[PDB]
Amino acid sequence: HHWGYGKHNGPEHWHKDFPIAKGERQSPVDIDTHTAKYDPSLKPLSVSYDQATSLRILNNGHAFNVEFDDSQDKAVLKGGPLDGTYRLIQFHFHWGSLDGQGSEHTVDKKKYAAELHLVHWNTKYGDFGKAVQQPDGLAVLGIFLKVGSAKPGLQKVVDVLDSIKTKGKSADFTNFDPRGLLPESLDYWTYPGSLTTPPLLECVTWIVLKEPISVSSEQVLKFRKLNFNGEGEPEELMVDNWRPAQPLKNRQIKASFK
Ligand SMILES: [Zn+2]
């Protein structure tokens, strides 16, 4: 009876195995755009992905992760609210069963069709495993997806999904360039929070871009053909793999922009 997103194991149940689910800096959260204060000391975000090396795409039973070689300083996030340099380890998405839901963060209670998470770890902790044990161990860049025009840079991801339909399947996935997933603007909101899946560790500086990217209905439809189950098990479509907004608890959300 492992955690997931169903009626009997979904986000409302997580606190039983992961008591930090009711902690002081849980994610995601609703971004109240009227109370997020502009902070002119926040720096431009620096996203250096030109040397990114993707290796593999994996269905882990909760999402698909596109994984990167993080054994050298190749694809780093820095600047913004961060001190130091954070190395990209993987990205993944959360999405809905319908276009009207799917994002984890919300913006004045608005839910987007999906949300992309580019996960980075603080190089001063040596690796991802040690970083998640630190309050500033991770920097996660969150990007909202709305349904409209296709995102051409997403199409190589969408097209390999039939090869990792079920939990546990992986596929070679080299030379994918994540710069094809970024909006024009790097204006962002930022706040201290957590992983949004178990173990829900409170190790993340969240950086959520104000500008969503557009993906086509056909692109998000193919996300929804994935499976939570493993091969040869009853088919359960991987949809609504999103945790809802959690209490802000007096944390302040800061805006990079006026
Ligand atoms: Zn995520």
Residue numbers in the entry: 3 to 125, 127 to 261
Provide the authors' own sentences about this structure as they appear in the paper.
Here, we show that fluorinated amino acids can be easily incorporated in proteins expressed in human cells by employing a medium switch strategy. This straightforward approach allows the incorporation of different fluorinated amino acids in the protein of interest, reaching fluorination efficiencies up to 60%, as confirmed by mass spectrometry and X-ray crystallography. We tested this approach on a set of soluble human proteins: α-synuclein (αSYN), copper-zinc superoxide dismutase (SOD1), carbonic anhydrase isoform 2 (CA2), the deglycase DJ-1, the N-terminal domain of heat shock protein 90 (Nt-HSP90), and the SOD-like domain of the copper chaperone for SOD (CCS-D2). We apply the approach to observe the interaction between an intracellular target, carbonic anhydrase 2, and its inhibitors, and to investigate how the formation of a complex between superoxide dismutase 1 and its chaperone CCS modulates the interaction of the chaperone subunit with the cellular environment.
To evaluate the impact of FAA incorporation on protein structure, which could negatively affect the significance of 19F NMR data for drug screening applications, we determined the structure of 6FW-CA2 by X-ray crystallography. The protein was purified from human cells after a 24 h ST expression protocol and subsequently crystallized. The 3D structure of 6FW-CA2 is perfectly superimposable with those already deposited in the PDB and shares the same space group and cell parameters (backbone RMSD 0.21 Å). The presence of fluorine atoms in all seven tryptophan residues is evident in the electron density. The occupancy values of the fluorine atoms computed during refinement ranged from 0.4 to 0.6, in good agreement with the percentage of 6FW incorporation obtained by MS. Therefore, the incorporation of 6FW at up to seven positions in the CA2 polypeptide does not significantly affect any structural features of the protein, making 6FW-CA2 amenable for protein–ligand interaction studies by 19F in-cell NMR. As a result, 6FW incorporation efficiency after an 8 h ST was the highest for both SOD1 and CA2 (>60% from MS), but the protein yields were the lowest among the three selected ST conditions. In contrast, a 24 h ST gave rise to the highest yields, even though the incorporation efficiency was <50% for both proteins. Remarkably, 6FW incorporation allowed distinguishing CA2 bound to different ligands, as the signal at −119.3 ppm either shifted to −119.0 ppm, broadened, or split into three separated peaks when 6FW-CA2 interacted with ETZ, MZA, or AAZ, respectively. In the case of CA2, the high number of tryptophan residues allowed probing several positions on the protein structure, some of which were clearly perturbed upon binding.
